[PDB]
């Protein structure tokens, strides 16, 4: 399956949190292609900015094996 | 995101200035436009499916894209493209109500370029589709609304290109 | 703003704006011109509102302006009045927006934490806002005052 | 009369430990977290 | 209803109703009496609205009332008209409520699935609702029509 | 939840009946009461912290409960009790706006008795606190609003007991 | 207590007690007899510690025992002293336990919320505890005082 | 959970009494026993695998249970049973250090009977295994420690039965 | 994380060498410093709120930052900044006990620069605040402890800058 | 180490070190000097401890050093002794640390897997460690021996 | 991933061409090879543990790597290295059945070089181990199977280097 490597930064505008949030704030992650759409939306809704997106696995414009 | 009213407020807040007449005038301008915008939004929501259909017919379909080896070939890709078209329409409607382009930047425009480049989706074709939607929308909304609607569609197009 | 709130709810639901939501937007745009005037009135009277409210607060709370109290001394008293001015500016922003959201982001989130570090008493701050409300109400017409009151009440509720 | 451990009680609090994986964390630190993931999701109450 | 929607948002946030939310409630209660009259008008004209809309729909879509088509035959045509009547009743409920929620629970959730099992074409149903809107608009005064239109538009949007 | 407007609608929907004048009259009745209710709700929200404080002073504090071996002894328990008091107040305010007791049943009342019995929280004392809040609320809201406010407070009390 | 804390950590790890953990338990049991004496000393001097600390606190904070202040009046002053007594009892419990957990459950969780409803100033309460520490330190031997100090410091840290 | 030291404290706290000599004596009693307990715990941890093996040999294995149609037949079931045995041992060790049976009630004992009945695990056989572990443990820990260890094992057995 | 004792061990382990007297001396050095460090840590924990207050007063407040258009303007931002200050203090205290700077690198220092740049938080001002905290801490801890405390504060400052 | 463990628990809770935790640190620093001596003793006697333990193991298990057995041959026997030496070094590290964590990372995680690939019998590795404990105990004073025993026992438990 | 059959299909699908005899011939070629491959895979699965052991003996063990200061020193690292070896073997077996190298690229090869460089794992030694596994595998599978097996092993080696 196609996989996405995503780097994004998210700010906590609603509430101040005592516990360390640094992992949540800046998170380079591998996302399944199917999941990424929803994940991208979630980052946008948070007001976080997605710094970089790359397709880690799979071939672009492949009809099958996707 | 921001709206026109909040945008004025935010600019004043960073200055620390109390709201002034010049600021008030901008707010007043928005308030008059508001009623028109609400009517336009309702029109778009009701005709959304058709708007997408017409726009696709104008640009996307009966083309190399739909033919094998084209980006929108296969049902899965076709469905994806029309889903994206719907997104653009919904967000443009939101922007029109808001009176501010910022929401487009915050939600639609951010990260889309990178996604599309990895996917190999063709930007110019997408832009073409957006422009087509604009034309269809312009008709339905009418004169009062079309000018307002057009700017947000153009904003999306400029961002992508 | 009203509009921002409506859009945000729609986006969460991933739907176009509901008719009811659209109706509220229509009502808001009609109300706006009246709202602008209410805001304008308070802006003009801003300096006096702050001054009068300050005096009332100090009368109601002798302690705050006492050697022990935080407000005591010229520098400190100025800062207390500056804070009152800040809150008034926020209230005006709220009235034009038609929602507390603008007020809320700038003033009500983390307010407890900020004041606790400063050691300023939160209830006294609330009293100051209450005082400002009374002054503002007098200058405003009754219906205008009611609209303004809601925003003032929210602030008092937030700082509690 | 009532005692400290009466309502919610003391135990339920303090048997919850937030776990965050850290890149530089030593293996044994990391594994303990990993084990707990398995523990909660797959209900492995032996806990390994 | 408007009120239910506002309460639900507040409960999710675990907060008392915002001033802006309260204002919308105030506006709604004022609007209600006008809304009741709009609903009453449509109820009285219900029978004719359905009949006229049906005819228009059948003219716009010959296929639906054709041997292949779902609507074809007396039994089927009656059911199609019954459906139009149902949607009109829902719209009246919506106008009094000031929100689409009442409409939504009864008519718009699972509608696609129900019609797909029936094999009724969804677009044709939408056209019928559009037709009903036009008839209803004519009987209503312009401002009243706009209010009614929003609810009609929602239905058309939902069934798409 | 349900509100008065929706309750009327739902009753008609099960019958399948279109809205009728008798139904309209009930709706109209609610609409007149509405304005009063909105004013009352704003008053309660602003004075909520004080209302709780006063009610606690009247019943809960300076009592065996707060003394060692009492349910509200220890900071943790004290904080829990005042949190519960706040819940009751917020929900009663919601019910007053709605004009319907159903939300209280759906959220607050359901399972509360059982929870309290397991916890060993004393129901009668809780009821006492609710009644105290009602009295304080009655003053602030004023007489017309008080009657409406009182019924929801009484509903909560009856449910718990 | 020390033992409870060790068990809890082991259970989270789902392992038998580590040698290091066992060693800490051994140290604690040896320390216990000394700890018991320290606790006994404070219990005997309890009445005077509270009285002296109260006076110091009131000198440090005139405001608290002033008409505006929460502590003002005989009833209120008694309650303030009762609170100080409560905290002292908790500290003694802590010393015997060898951990703050006993103290923490009874006194430090929800303390902010309780005092905020009461409107008692949290910093003043902290000062009272600091005052009690100083009195207690004087009666205790130096090493004993250091042990007691840690528990006193925790309380001050918890409530500020 | 609770430990002996905290149990004394809690009893005093509900009374509101400061710690007194009689209370101190109970605490002192615990402190003397403590050193022995720590030594016993270390012994058990080191020999845990063997303890389980010996106990199984005494009761569980060479039995109908292990034979086909028995609860402990199949590798999966056998492994489950020895896992349960380990749990009991670990918790008993915790209880012995604590000097209080409460942890057993809070973690091990709660809902176990019901779980076992639904599963069809035989309670009496499990109890037999616990008793066997106790005997093995008694040997390793030595006599002074054994008495202390035995009570917790017996507590588990009584709970299950 | 790593501590001084473990750091020595790890260096020996990579060499494969058994612990030697020279290594032992380093360990011994740490053990003497330990007692001082524990005392310092307790001082810092008790005075943490004040330390932050004083440091903010010295650098952060009465400044453009707090004024509108400044990074620490608005309650939310102000609260965030003091939360960050607390983090730095807590971690520095941990490092001082440990005798090793590694924990600062693993938790605080890693990714902070990037986070701050995205946020638009000013690094130099933050560094200023850290230096201010150091000065306040130095006073409270006393001279012997201050030298030890200072190095960790300086380490944080260097990392951020 | 003791200190690392305490800090880690505090960081998870996001709190400053508890008094109880601080007390344990104090106890550890006092113990450390004694601990250093215990470690030093074992290091000096390392060579003999390994040798004596090895002989005991080989007497206990003739098979391992037999033509069939894995340990058989000079090369193999040396490797078995080298392993025993490794474990002793780990134990010394543990004593100075006051915690098993240093031991655990280097020696006890993945040990089963490594030995299973090698085909070395684990239930005899454990015996070797037990043997080393007995030798080490004799050289150590009683109280010192008890401290050392705990670490030795942990190793035996871990396998 | 992709397999030989799907690869042919995919190539035709992008062209939009129906399957033709030339394409069929490639598919037919695969089908004949298939039976051999299945036998080889079963051999490898049964002897997997031994294959890894032999390969490690040939390259990894009795080396500086295993000695202190080497990348495979410590039990944890040793276990990791043999786990990686197993991965390579399993994936090569999958590739051999599939008749396509793509799976190796998609799962094993992608990002491995970068991971290893950050870790400081030595690539050349790893490659050596892969080559050793190939030699052992070649023997067990037999000559016809060996040629097919070798290409996938070589593919892994080339990717890493
Ligand atoms: C024939 C059985 C029914 C029918 C067909 C019909 N299709 C279109 C238009 C398109 N059909 C497709 C379909 C595909 N493209 C793909 O890549 C795949 C998967 C391999 C499929 C199945 C597409 C993409 C189009 C768009 C136009 C194009 O050719 O590029 C039409 C015309 C559309 C219109 O609305 O005018 C029609 C009529 N319709 C029926 O009624 C038949 C039962
Ligand atoms: C249609 C006009 C064009 C087209 C569409 C197309 N898109 C994808 C895949 C994705 N599109 C998006 C877009 C968004 N992400 C967001 O966050 C938003 C804002 C709400 C948008 C608009 C994303 C994230 C994806 C990937 C995940 C997913 O599938 O949902 C495809 C599929 C590409 C592929 O085959 O791999 C297509 C076809 N492509 C065209 O050619 C048209 C010009
Ligand atoms: C205060 C008037 C009285 C009182 C209350 C009290 N309650 C608890 C604990 C709980 N109370 C609840 C109740 C609710 N949960 C809900 O969802 C609702 C409806 C919105 C209610 C009212 C629950 C579930 C708990 C336990 C969970 C929790 O505390 O988060 C306590 C303390 C018990 C404890 O051990 O913490 C107390 C004291 N008791 C009195 O003495 C007053 C008469
Ligand atoms: C003295 C340093 C400060 C002070 C004290 C003060 N307290 C109250 C009222 C209460 N105090 C408590 C506190 C506790 N209950 C517990 O369970 C514990 C831990 C064991 C504590 C510390 C409670 C519950 C009350 C409520 C009344 C009651 O006990 O029934 C008051 C008066 C309250 C009021 O005025 O409303 C005062 C004055 N106040 C200060 O300002 C001093 C600095
Ligand atoms: C023979 C190849 C090897 C061997 C066997 C051996 N087994 C035991 C004891 C038991 N073996 C089992 C096994 C099973 N129970 C099941 O349900 C299944 C799956 C269906 C299996 C495989 C059990 C349960 C026992 C315990 C006794 C009982 O049946 O109740 C022994 C005796 C060891 C002892 O002390 O109990 C032996 C010797 N051992 C070897 O050395 C051979 C290589
Ligand atoms: C061994 C002496 C006896 C035995 C054990 C046995 N248990 C199971 C299955 C389960 N046992 C438990 C027990 C617990 N779960 C918990 O959470 C707790 C307390 C916190 C305990 C002690 C549970 C829940 C299960 C089910 C799922 C699981 O095993 O994780 C079995 C197997 C039953 C099955 O069908 O899976 C066995 C064999 N049974 C005997 O006959 C011995 C006397
Ligand atoms: C007056 C009603 C009360 C009072 C106020 C007081 N405030 C300060 C100092 C500050 N207060 C603020 C407040 C804000 N900054 C913001 O961004 C916002 C939201 C828009 C607010 C409300 C800040 C940032 C400061 C710090 C100084 C600075 O801004 O430069 C003081 C000074 C006390 C001190 O110790 O410095 C005082 C006295 N004090 C009372 O007692 C009154 C009840
Ligand atoms: C105070 C001296 C300066 C300052 C601080 C500031 N920080 C934020 C937001 C964040 N700060 C952090 C930092 C950390 N989180 C961690 O877990 C750690 C390590 C333990 C650190 C150091 C993070 C992650 C955030 C983002 C979300 C959050 O709230 O934690 C802000 C707010 C930025 C915004 O606009 O939201 C501020 C103001 N800024 C200054 O002006 C001071 C110089
Ligand atoms: C002696 C008690 C037993 C025994 C020994 C034996 N060991 C090996 C081989 C290896 N031992 C290790 C183990 C470690 N490497 C590490 O880094 C650590 C942690 C510090 C340990 C414990 C390793 C890596 C090997 C592989 C070869 C090498 O050292 O490079 C052998 C040879 C293996 C073989 O089968 O050829 C032997 C014989 N064997 C027994 O039977 C005794 C019980």
Give CA–CA dist B108/B93, Å, rounded: 13
Give CA–CA dist C156/C148, Å, rounded: 13
Give CA–CA dist C142/D2, Å, rounded: 54
Residue K18 neighbours by CB distance under 10 Å: 7
Give CA–CA dist G6/G26, Å, rounded: 12
Q: For residue C6, which of C99, C102, C105, C104 has the smallest C-alpha distance?
A: C99
K103 Cβ partners below 8 Å, 6+ apart? K1, K2, K91, K94, K95
If you write DSSP's letter for every residue of chain J in order, what string do you get?
-HHHHHHHHHHHHTSPPPHHHHHHHHHHHHHHHHHHHHHHHHHHTHHHHHHHHHHHHHHH-TTTTSSSSTT-SHHHHHHHHHHHHHHHHHHHHHHHHTSSHHHIIIIISSHHHHHHHHT--HHHHHHHHHHHHHHHHHHS-HHHHHHHHHHHHHHHHH-
Superfamily of domain I1-161: Phycocyanins (1.10.490.20)
Helix, strand or coil for residue E61?
Answer: coil
Q: Is the CB of F119 under 6 A from ligand 3?
A: yes
Interface check for G152 against chain J (CB to CB < 8 A): the answer is: no
Give CA–CA dist F35/F97, Å, rounded: 9
Give CA–CA dist B92/B96, Å, rounded: 6
Structure token pair of residue I142: 């006393």
Structure token pair of residue K136: 């052992």
If you write DSSP's letter for every residue of H109-129 in order, what string do you get?
ITTHHHHHHHHT--HHHHHHH
* B121 torsion bin: left (phi>0), alpha (psi -120 to 50), beta (else): beta
Atom of ligand 4 nearest to the CA of G84: 2
- Give yes or no for a contact between J85 and J129, defined as CB atoms under 8 angstroms apart: no
- Give yes or no for a contact between E68 and E19, defined as CB atoms under 8 angstroms apart: no
Q: Cα distance from J32 to chain I (closest Cα, Å)?
A: 7
DSSP code of F67? S
Q: Is the CB of F85 under 6 A from ligand 3?
A: yes
- Residue of chain I nearest D26, judged by CA positions: I1
Element (H, E) at B46: helix B21-46
Structure token pair of residue C66: 């006492």
Interface check for H83 against chain D (CB to CB < 8 A): the answer is: yes
Sheet holding A3-9, edge to edge: A26-32, A3-9, A49-57
- Give yes or no for a contact between F8 and F34, defined as CB atoms under 8 angstroms apart: no
- Give yes or no for a contact between E60 and E67, defined as CB atoms under 8 angstroms apart: no
Tell me the C-alpha to C-alpha distance, in Å, between residue J56 and each of C148, J60, J134, J157, K69: 91, 6, 10, 20, 30
Buried b (16+ CB within 10 A) or exposed e, G83-93: bbbbbbbbbbb
Q: Is the CB of F65 under 6 A from ligand 3?
A: yes
Q: Cα distance from J13 to chain A (closest Cα, Å)?
A: 8
Buried b (16+ CB within 10 A) or exposed e, I85-117: bbbbbbbbbbbbbbbbbbbbbbbbbbbbeebbe
Q: Is the dihedral of CA F109, F113, F118, F122 positive or negative?
A: positive
Q: For residue I132, which of I103, I154, I99, I147 has the smallest C-alpha distance?
A: I154
- Give yes or no for a contact between E1 and E100, defined as CB atoms under 8 angstroms apart: no
Element (H, E) at A56: strand A49-57
Residue I46 neighbours by CB distance under 10 Å: 24
- Give yes or no for a contact between E126 and E154, defined as CB atoms under 8 angstroms apart: no
Give CA–CA dist E83/E160, Å, rounded: 16
Structure token pair of residue B55: 């726009």
Helix, strand or coil for residue K110?
Answer: coil
Give CA–CA dist D11/C36, Å, rounded: 56
The closest CB to that of C36, out of B1, B2, B24, belongs to B24
Give CA–CA dist I97/G17, Å, rounded: 24
Count how many Cα atoms sit within 13 Å of the Cα of residue I76 in the half-sphere of its side chain.
Answer: 14
> B91-96 contacts: CB < 8 A, separation 24 or more?
B91/B156, B92/B133, B92/B137, B92/B149, B92/B152, B92/B153, B92/B156, B93/B41, B93/B44, B93/B45, B93/C16, B93/C17, B94/C7, B94/C10, B94/C11, B95/B152, B95/B155, B96/B37, B96/B40, B96/B41, B96/B145, B96/B148, B96/B149, B96/B152
**Residue ID of nearest Cα to ligand 8 atom 25:** A11
Size of interface A-K (CB pairs under 8 A): 20
Q: Is the CB of H115 under 6 A from ligand 6?
A: yes
- Give yes or no for a contact between G126 and G160, defined as CB atoms under 8 angstroms apart: yes
For tokens 């995919």, the residue is K10
DSSP code of A66? -
Interface check for J7 against chain H (CB to CB < 8 A): the answer is: no
Helix, strand or coil for residue I99?
Answer: coil
Tell me the C-alpha to C-alpha distance, in Å, between residue H109 and each of H112, H118, H157, J121: 6, 16, 10, 38
For tokens 């790593």, the residue is I2
Q: For residue B19, which of C108, C89, C135 has the smallest C-alpha distance?
A: C89
Give CA–CA dist K104/K111, Å, rounded: 12
Residues that constitute the known binding site of C for (2R,3E)-phycocyanobilin: 70, 80, 82-83
Atom of ligand 4 nearest to the CA of F78: 24
Give CA–CA dist B26/C96, Å, rounded: 12
Give CA–CA dist H103/H92, Å, rounded: 9
- Give yes or no for a contact between I95 and A10, defined as CB atoms under 8 angstroms apart: no
**Residue ID of nearest Cα to ligand 1 atom 29:** B62
- Give yes or no for a contact between G27 and J27, defined as CB atoms under 8 angstroms apart: yes
E6 Cβ partners below 8 Å, 6+ apart? E17, E21, E24, E25, F97
If you write DSSP's letter for every residue of B91-148 in order, what string do you get?
HHHHHHHHT-SHHIIIIIITTHHHHHHHHT--HHHHHHHHHHHHHHHHHHH-HHHHHH
At residue A5, what are phi and psi to the nearest 5 degrees?
Answer: -100, 120
Residue E83 neighbours by CB distance under 10 Å: 19
- Residue of chain F nearest D5, judged by CA positions: F119
**Secondary structure percentages of chain G, helix, strand, coil, to 5:** 80, 0, 20
Interface check for C62 against chain A (CB to CB < 8 A): the answer is: no
Element (H, E) at A7: strand A3-9
DSSP code of A21? -
Chains in touch with C (≥3 Cβ pairs < 8 A): A, B, E, F, G, I
Chains in touch with G (≥3 Cβ pairs < 8 A): C, D, F, H, I, J
Q: C-alpha E19: how far from its chain's center?
A: 30
DSSP code of A55? E
Buried b (16+ CB within 10 A) or exposed e, J19-49: bbbbbbbbbbbebbeebbebbbbbbebbeeb
F14 Cβ partners below 8 Å, 6+ apart? none
Q: For residue G107, which of G90, G131, G129, G92 has the smallest C-alpha distance?
A: G90
The answer for C 57-116 residues in CB contact with F (under 8 A) is none
Give CA–CA dist B116/B60, Å, rounded: 17
- Give yes or no for a contact between G109 and F78, defined as CB atoms under 8 angstroms apart: no
D4, H83: Cβ pair inside 8 Å?
no
C153, F48: Cβ pair inside 8 Å?
no
Atom of ligand 3 nearest to the CA of F130: 2
Closest ligand to the CA of G130: 4
Residue G155 neighbours by CB distance under 10 Å: 28
Helix, strand or coil for residue A29?
Answer: strand
- Residue of chain C nearest G65, judged by CA positions: C63
Element (H, E) at F46: helix F21-46
Q: Is the CB of G124 under 6 A from ligand 4?
A: yes
Rounded to the nearest angstrom, the distance between the alpha carbon of K87 and the centre of ligand 2 is: 34
Query: Between β-strands A3-9 and A49-57, what pairing exists: parallel, antiparallel or unpaired?
Result: antiparallel
Helix, strand or coil for residue G118?
Answer: helix
Helix, strand or coil for residue A9?
Answer: strand
Give CA–CA dist B95/C11, Å, rounded: 12
- Residues of chain C in contact with residue G121, where contact means CB-CB under 8 angstroms, are 121
Ligand-binding annotation for G70, yes or no, is: yes
Residue A52 neighbours by CB distance under 10 Å: 11
SS3 labels along A31-45:
EEHHHHHHHHHHHHH
Give the residue, out of I56, I80, I117, I123, with the most ligand 8 atoms within 8 A of its beta carbon, to mutate for a pocket test: I80
Q: Which of J100, J146, J157 is the mutation pick for testing H, counting most H CBs within 10 A?
A: J157
Structure token pair of residue F99: 């004009």
**Residue ID of nearest Cα to ligand 7 atom 40:** C71
Closest ligand to the CA of B123: 2
Closest ligand to the CA of G53: 4
Q: For residue H19, which of G38, K39, J157, I79 has the smallest C-alpha distance?
A: G38
Structure token pair of residue D42: 């797959």
Structure token pair of residue B34: 């508001």
- Give yes or no for a contact between E154 and E67, defined as CB atoms under 8 angstroms apart: no
H6, G46: Cβ pair inside 8 Å?
no
Determination technique for this PDB entry? cryo-EM
- Give yes or no for a contact between J114 and J125, defined as CB atoms under 8 angstroms apart: no
Give CA–CA dist E21/E17, Å, rounded: 6
A19 Cβ partners below 8 Å, 6+ apart? D18, J14
DSSP code of F60? I
Structure token pair of residue E17: 């109703």
If you write DSSP's letter for every residue of K22-65 in order, what string do you get?
HHHHHHHHHHHHHHHHHHHHHHHHHTHHHHHHHHIIIIISSSTT
CB-count exposure of residue I10 (10 Å: 0-12, 13-18, 19+) = middle
Ligand-binding annotation for E70, yes or no, is: yes
- Residues of chain F in contact with residue D2, where contact means CB-CB under 8 angstroms, are 69-71, 73, 77, 120
Structure token pair of residue G12: 């989270």
F43 Cβ partners below 8 Å, 6+ apart? F140, F141, F145
SS3 labels along C63-104:
CCCCCCCCCCCHHHHHHHHHHHHHHHHHHHHHHHHCCCHHHH
**Secondary structure percentages of chain C, helix, strand, coil, to 5:** 80, 0, 20
Give domain limits for chain H.
1-161
């Amino acid at each position: 399956s196609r996989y996405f490597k995503v780097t994004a930064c998210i700010p906590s505008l609603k509430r101040v949190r005592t516990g360390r949030e640094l992992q949540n704030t800046f998170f380079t992650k591998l996302v399944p292609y199917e999941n990424w759409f929803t994940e991208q939306q979630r980052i946008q809704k948070a007001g976080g900015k997605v710094l970089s997106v790359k397709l880690f696995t799979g071939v672009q414009g492949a009809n099958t094996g996707v | 995101m921001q709206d026109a009213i909040t945008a004025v407020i935010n600019n004043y807040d960073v200055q620390g200035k109390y709201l002034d007449g010049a600021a008030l005038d901008k707010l007043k301008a928005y308030f008059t436009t508001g009623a028109v915008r609400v009517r336009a939004a309702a029109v778009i929501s009701s005709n959304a499916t058709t708007i997408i259909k017409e726009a696709a017919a104008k640009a996307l379909i009966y083309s190399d894209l739909t033919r094998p080896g084209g980006n929108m070939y296969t049902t899965r890709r076709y469905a994806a493209c029309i889903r994206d078209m719907d997104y653009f329409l919904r967000y443009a409607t939101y922007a029109m109500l808001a009176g501010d382009p910022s929401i487009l930047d915050e939600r639609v425009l951010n990260g889309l370029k990178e996604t599309y480049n990895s996917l190999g989706v063709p930007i110019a074709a997408t832009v073409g589709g957006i422009q087509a939607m604009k034309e269809v929308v312009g008709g339905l909304v009418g004169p009062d609304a079309a000018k307002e609607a057009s700017i947000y569609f153009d904003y999306l197009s400029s961002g992508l290109s | 703003s009203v509009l921002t709130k409506a859009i945000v709810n729609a986006d969460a639901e991933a739907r176009y704006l509901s008719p009811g939501e659209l109706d509220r937007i229509k009502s808001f745009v009609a109300s706006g011109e009246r709202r602008l005037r209410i805001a304008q009135t308070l802006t003009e009277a801003r300096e006096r509102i702050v001054k009068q409210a300050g005096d009332q607060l100090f009368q109601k709370r002798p302690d705050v302006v006492s050697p022990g109290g935080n407000a005591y001394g010229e520098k400190m008293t100025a800062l207390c009045l500056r804070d009152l001015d800040y809150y008034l500016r926020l209230v005006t922003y709220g009235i034009v927006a038609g929602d507390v959201t603008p007020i809320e982001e700038i003033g009500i989130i983390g307010v407890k934490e900020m004041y606790n570090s400063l050691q300023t008493p939160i209830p006294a701050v609330a009293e100051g806002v209450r005082a400002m409300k009374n002054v503002a109400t007098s200058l405003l017409s009754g219906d205008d005052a009611a609209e303004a009151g809601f925003y003032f009440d929210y602030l008092v509720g937030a700082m509690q | 009369g009532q005692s400290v451990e009466v309502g919610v009680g003391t135990l339920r609090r303090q048997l919850e430990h937030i776990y965050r994986i850290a890149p530089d964390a030593t293996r044994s630190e990391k594994d303990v977290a990993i084990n707990a993931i398995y523990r909660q999701v797959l209900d492995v109450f032996a806990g390994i």
